[model samples]
Target: EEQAIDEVLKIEFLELALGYQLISLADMKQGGDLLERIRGIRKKIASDYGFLMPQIRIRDNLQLPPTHYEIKLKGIVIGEGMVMPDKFLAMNTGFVNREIEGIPTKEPAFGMDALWIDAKNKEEAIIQGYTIIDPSTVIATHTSELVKKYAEDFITKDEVKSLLERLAKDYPTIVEESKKIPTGAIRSVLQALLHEKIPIKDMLTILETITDIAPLVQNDVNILTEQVRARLSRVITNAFKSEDGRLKFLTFSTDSEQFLLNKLRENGTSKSLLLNVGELQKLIEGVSEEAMKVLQKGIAPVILIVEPNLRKALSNQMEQARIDVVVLSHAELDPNSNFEALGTIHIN
Candidate 1:
């Protein structure tokens, strides 16, 4: 008899770009109990999100690391009987190099430009790689100058000075508000100010100097306080929205039927579903559970719809199913106050 594969077990690994350190699931053990707690958080993510939780890996080199680093790490997933065919689908595994004064002075450090993996059985994982060439790196090289241009496009010097004067009037209120939030919140606020071409660091320095405030806030808040701070931080982060802003990471899920349907639609191929409204409702209701099963089976080339309700439902089910690595669809913003969602179908 053939060995049975459980379609209920989901696992995922998340690699975080830590800006100079390479951290993997194995590295978490070195940070003492704190690292263990962090590892527990990943498990909780798997339990809560309905996908196999990907191992949390961190890459922190000032320069981009080789693709082999990620391939070796993901090999562990294959060992567990899941295939990771689309290397791009692998979280926390991407190349990044620093750009100064708007110039990309370095070549692509990773030999492979893009990669994907697939596993046919619980025993064998397949891999594919691609090379991508784009001009974004060249544009990124002049980032500082671009930022200056970006700043000039919005506010003039007089406007900035006037805003500073107004802020100075409410300086105490701002300082007090910052005090109530975590240091991360303060940092985010500062970063947002920088994005808006506002020079607030000097104001922050003044506030600290006058109020005897330490540069770093104490991380001694109670659990409830920490929770509140986190909630407040998310709210604040969401408030600073821009059409040309950086992308935020998100996740969702879909089943083989839904995935195939989408692929067909993309390719301009048609499909007929012989179901009434009631049957459709049943299908919709069961989508999350079905998708969770697919994820637990560790199938590669899984396609997830970006619909909000569907994604939320799938996320909830994947958590219950213990499926890891929720792959979400990508979107790009349009300058005309909208967004365009793209897929593979238009190519052929």
Candidate 2:
């Protein structure tokens, strides 16, 4: 079984296939600036984001539309977009009253409503206060976001082995924890770090935390991931730091906490707590409405849960709702952290 898993870890790659009409953007002789931009992205990810960079194969796909491109990771099509190099994309900031006349579409990266304007009207559009973006920037933005979204997928057992080498020479790095746990287990736990948008660049701290928690949370990736988050309390808390230097958030009241706990214990035989859609409706609405309020107030929505064990379950279930709020487990916080949770989700 160990030998079989070894082969799987060695395989990892990413691909960005351009359409037939867009080949010039990647070809240097054709004044293609895309490759340089790609290099910039590579440098940023390797040095800044600190992940083993995946080689992105650039090729033209005849099957795709002339101006369309698709981003593929692990042979799966995560996102695709169409670009018109002859014209530019103008994004309305919603605060703009005037409009530009051209092809109407949504920005592929962030889904903001946009329009394609001719080069001649570029200054005119800018005068109207619309955000002007070049065709190449559009694709680059989309690619960057998608890469971060699936950043965890890039870490394989091969990367794990490489990271361990760095650990051996340095003080007890992940090498101590990697000594017992399988590479697959290590990769799974680290991937969880990326899934929650946490940077895995600090591999030393991560492995040390794993070394301490491995025996206690054996075979349960979720629990192990949460324990690691607790160790990363300082960094996690700083992510949501407000402009005035306060950590602002929304949290669940005690009533909702007890309700979820009771439901979990209600089904003793099964570990998965499956709340019916009907039962989840009120909870979903309460969360969504409160989150919208925060968004309107110019604050990014964040939710702090009462129990650490239930955070993962709640996040998975809340994926059904429209709100894209981050749910932090109580275990993932520091006692002295300065924070204000202004809103509360208490489903009556």
Candidate 3:
């Protein structure tokens, strides 16, 4: 009985609990190809992000509303959306120009306000210049969005073990070296990578970097993640690329760098962070201002040349201002990479 209960309550990396009315979507003869759609989503996420995310398990739940579905990450609901099994969701471009008689809803994928109208309205909705989408597509999209949002929680020790087994084929030496570290430690490091939106797909490079740095960091998850990120310089640069096809970034002013470096040392004492109330505010305000500017330009807030040891603290400090900056050590940047400077954040 306990085994059965444990099996029943098994955690899912990514899962969808659908309503009774949506069972036909997963059944092939029912003209719904949701299983295939989910396979595609899984493959795309794996390819895009460098982690072999597990297959999505889709099952029906009777307690749910007949038209509603919820996406779960590791057994916790992350996103929910309602879909009309028999109708289409239509979204207008720019501003919804004309009124249409249908159930008002928001586009599940992009959050555009939408209308759920019957199939009969498809032609008119198209003629009225509205983009129409099927229900299955909406659920798949919304679920994928949440998966990316919470991907840090998606990895497990099992996944890390599987990844190493695969990497052992191409890079056997590093894989053998990786086994020296605890699987739990590697799992924590990988989760840190995903949390920061870094792809774990380049496992070969990552494992090699970790193998070298693991001893030095002494199982410190964040430090290991930073070393891995530094080794993934080109990948990080490509990810942080701006719309104008340039890598735009913000760096620290000289005094700011000294202030942070001095945090670890204070008149022969260690790790004192000897900054007063005024200095604390002065530390983040400039970076917060620049980090937002980076996002507003439609790019990532990648703060470059951050001292390695202070990266996490500075990022956490910036987080209070609703600005999450990627702190990159200079070791992580390639000298030859193209970077269009957006300027430095200074407390002048």
Candidate 4:
């Protein structure tokens, strides 16, 4: 038994296909056609990308949630001269036994989850199986060697001393500037600095100094600041209360049919209200004054602006109407502008 155990070798590979849609047994004919298509695609991918084809299995017992399904494939490698097991090699046999009768079996009846090739030596096995064996091995070793070489060449003892000296010289200015600005703006500034190929750690030190000086400047211009804040707050509050409110608080990415179906399932209170861009644009443009009334009622609504330029135009329109506190989405931020310099106004 010990000698036999040493002689026998087993290699198992498993793959899962998640998010599969299931078909009823009554639709077996069409399902078979679908299976053929999948096989063709798999063969093409194997030939093109040089990946090993894996054996396929359907495990009906491994049920998925109503919205999802799983198809599992297992590849078993045995000794060179060993005959492949009928159960392992047969394509449609598993499906016939498990699916034909209402035996409540979990495996598929007709198609394999994937193709599997077997051999004796690893390279020989891969060649026989039409697969690329140990594909990542060379690249992984190369990456490790490259990292070590770079570290040894660049991260020297003298460089460490110079870094420490720079930090010591810059630390006081860093602390003084950091206190002056909001963290969000500071982050954007740092991002911009890095985008221009500036060293991140060095730019971060400069940001610290800028932040420290921000608070002192605000006090020098308190009256103008208060007026601006008051105007912005009034604008935001009035827009929230209006019937044709500039803000659509909650929106969804799904189609209207799916949205409505989900709404029906959850009851009406949770429905997704989709905004018509053209209609919304016209309404906001025309009803700016009345919209201000709604915004003034102190509602913080979430607006989803789809078009690239719509947010800015809408923001400007709202400000003209004396409605403030427009929060643009990430996509709304100007791609070329210095976002850190353009401070945001949040109205309550």
Estimate the TM-score of every prediction.
0.21, 0.75, 0.65, 0.17
Worst 10 residues of 1 by lDDT: 77-86
lDDT of each: 0.31, 0.72, 0.73, 0.30
> In angstroms, what RMSD does candidate 2 have relative to the true structure?
5.7
- Select the stronger candidate by TM-score from 3 and 4: 3
lDDT of 2: 0.72
- Kindly report the root-mean-square deviation of model 1 from the true structure over all alpha carbons: 20.2
lDDT of 3 by residue, 1-348 (tens): 568988888756677999988877778887887788876888887876877777888889889998889887767787887788878887754334565788886576645567899999988787777778888888888877677767776686677778888888877888898889877888887888777667788888877777788788777676678778888888776666665556667777788677677665423211234567777777667776676565544344455557666666665555554565666666666666677777787855
The full ranking of all candidates by lDDT, starting with the best, is 3, 2, 1, 4
Descending-TM-score candidate ranking: 2, 3, 1, 4
Off by over 4 Å in 2: 1-12, 27-31, 92-102, 127-129, 172-174, 237-274, 284-309, 319-325, 330-348
Candidate 3 Cα errors over 4 Å, as ranges: 1-13, 27-30, 87-106, 109-133, 237-311, 314-348
How would you encode candidate 2's per-residue C-alpha lDDT over 300-322 as one tens digit per residue? 53555557656776776666554
lDDT: worst 10-residue window of model 4: 78-87
Over 1-348, each residue of candidate 4 has an lDDT whose tens digit, in order, gives 576764566433232222223322113454323233333433443332222233333322224442233332223221011111111121121212221111111112111121222323334333334222121211122222222212222223343334334555756555444545555444443333222112223333344434444455442222222222222332223322324323333222335224323323212222222335664454344344333332333222323322322333444444444443333334322333221211111210
lDDT of 4: 0.30
